Amino acid sequence: GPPGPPGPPGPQGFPGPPGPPGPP
Amino acid sequence: GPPGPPGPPGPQGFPGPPGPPGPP
Amino acid sequence: GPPGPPGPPGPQGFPGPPGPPGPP
C-alpha cells in the first residue's frame, strides 16, 4: 500500500573540532 | 506497504574542546 | 507501510573556543 511516514531523525553529528591556539 | 522516506538528518554535534594554550 | 529508516548523522559541531592565553 502507501509508503510509511518518514523515518526518525538520524544520529547526532560528531563533536566539533578543537578551537585554535589561545592568544599569545 | 513499503518503508517510508529516510528521516531527517540528526542534530548537530556538540561544540569542540578549547584549543591548546597560546604560543609564547 | 512502516516508518522510514533513520535519517543520516547530523552535521559536525561547531569549532571549540580559542585555548588559554599562552606564556609571556
Residue numbers in the entry:
A (entry chain B), B (entry chain C), C (entry chain A): 25 to 47, 50
The authors write:
The characteristic structure of a collagen-like peptide is a triple helix composed of three chains. Each chain adopts a well-extended PPII conformation with successive Gly-X-Y triplets.
In this study, in order to gain structural insights into an NH–π interaction between Gln and Phe and better understand its chemical properties, we solved a crystal structure of a collagen-like peptides (GPO)3GPQGFO(GPO)3, abbreviated as GPQGFO, and characterized the side chain interactions using several lines of evidence including circular dichroism, quantum chemical analysis, molecular dynamics simulation, and structural bioinformatics. The GPQGFO peptide crystallizes with the triple helical structure characteristic of collagen molecules with 1.385 Å resolution. Two axial pairs and one lateral were observed in the structure depending on the relative positions of the interacting amino acids. The conformations were located at the region with dNM ~3.3 Å, θ ~10° and ω ~150°, well within the empirical cutoffs for NH–π interactions (dNM < 4.3 Å, −25° < θ < 25°, and ω > 120°) extracted from the previous data-mining of protein structures. The side chains were pointed in opposite directions (dNM = 7.4 Å), which did not form any interactions. The MD data suggested that the Q-F pairs in the crystal structure should be maintained in solution to stabilize the protein, consistent with the observations in the CD experiments.
